[PDB]
């Protein structure tokens, strides 16, 4: 029943975005996706997909690569040239997806932390980090108050006196 | 056959939406580059951390 953030797990119920908010207040529990940080991560992954095919490989008349007869020296060199090429490109492909996947995991992890810190900044001295990805907001925060946090218009001076009294 | 494909191999035409290819080192046209791997999976999403009870 109690809600928990990203430190512990992910949310299978979230389908309208990649990152989002869950809250529990006097009116009940709710969920909402954060679209800007969802698209900020998607924009980067789209950019990767664009850069991996951005260069066209267009080859026409090349060398012969299969042979029906034993010839010796020249054919040895033709086979060696093609095998060398394939091994180098096979290496380039293996390193590329490894580097890209490491960066994709990093950038998506970063978008989560940026949304958490962005929220931490808004709340200032009116909330505390519970340590599981959630904030304990020390004042009455109705649905309209939660939405002000989600859309970045929350004014901390309004609830500051109330929140400081509950914290201490 | 009656179709459209920029890339031709002795095995037949192949599309070129992927950067690499494992069908045949003999190609003609705008083709993916030939590699030895049969599959390379590029992540298009974040780490999947299924939820707790």
């Amino acid at each position, epitope marked *: 029943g109690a809600i928990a953030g990203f430190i512990e797990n992910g949310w299978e119920g979230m389908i309208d*975005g990649w990152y989002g908010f869950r809250h529990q207040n006097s009116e009940g529990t709710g969920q909402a996706a954060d*679209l*800007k940080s*969802t*698209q900020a991560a*998607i924009d980067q*992954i*789209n950019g990767k*997909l*664009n850069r991996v*095919i*951005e*260069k*066209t490989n*267009e080859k026409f008349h090349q060398i012969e690569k299969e042979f029906s007869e034993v010839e010796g020296r020249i054919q040895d060199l033709e086979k060696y040239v093609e095998d060398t090429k394939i091994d180098l490109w096979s290496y380039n492909a293996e390193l590329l997806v490894a580097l890209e996947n490491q960066h994709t995991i990093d950038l998506t992890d970063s978008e989560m932390n940026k949304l958490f810190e962005k929220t931490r900044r808004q709340l200032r001295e009116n909330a505390e980090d519970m340590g599981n990805g959630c904030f304990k907001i020390y004042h009455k925060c109705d649905n309209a108050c939660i939405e002000s946090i989600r859309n970045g218009t929350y004014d901390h001076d309004v609830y500051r006196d109330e929140a400081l009294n509950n914290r201490f | 056959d009656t179709c*459209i494909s*920029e890339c031709i191999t002795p095995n037949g035409s192949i599309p070129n*939406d992927k950067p690499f290819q494992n069908v045949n080192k003999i190609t003609y046209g*705008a083709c993916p580059k030939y590699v030895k791997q049969n599959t390379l999976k590029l992540a*298009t*999403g974040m780490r999947n951390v299924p939820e707790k009870a």
Partner: antibody
Amino acid sequence: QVQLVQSGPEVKKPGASVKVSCKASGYSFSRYGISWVRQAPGQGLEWLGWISGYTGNTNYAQKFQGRVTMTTDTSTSTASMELRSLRSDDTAVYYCARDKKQGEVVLPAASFRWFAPWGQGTLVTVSS
Amino acid sequence: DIQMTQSPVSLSASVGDRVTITCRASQSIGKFLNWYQQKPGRAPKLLIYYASNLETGGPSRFSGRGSETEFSLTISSLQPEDFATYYCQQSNNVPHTFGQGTKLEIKR
């Protein structure tokens, strides 16, 4: 039929502002964006900018920075374009077009980085 | 900005003819090039997207080719409906830019 329907024609005196709206139907308006393109009479097509129906993010051509504001409204599925400080050479037929899929990773051949469909057009005449 | 150059500026051909329009970018745009057909007095309409893909409605006599810097549009057997103006357009970088158009008219 996926469709963009634009507001009626406008006649404006120099120095005024014009606001043109595009109403979408037949598709998920919040999962795409809208690009605005204008065409002066007997001329070619010129890109003004783009706004996302998902985020509200905007891209303006440097030529129009400070003069254009694009807005999107999810509930009415309507995108708007406002051009300020109009001049005589702002006279054109203004088009909107659905552009760029949002909210999901897309391969290039499925990115919808192309203008389709188009609105019917909005004629804006700027003359004193 | 990236510049798009279309050739020829104008072209006259007969019904059943085979024609080819050319579009050129000042720098590489990948395959993010689109083609639009505009009939006089009407809004532009998408014909080819991502260099070579026919919009699902589209007639099979239109075909697109090219990548990077050089692109083409081909009509294998010209029909009366095909005589209009054709614009190529680049979607790789903002700001998106159009070619100046190729007007296709009937020979007589």
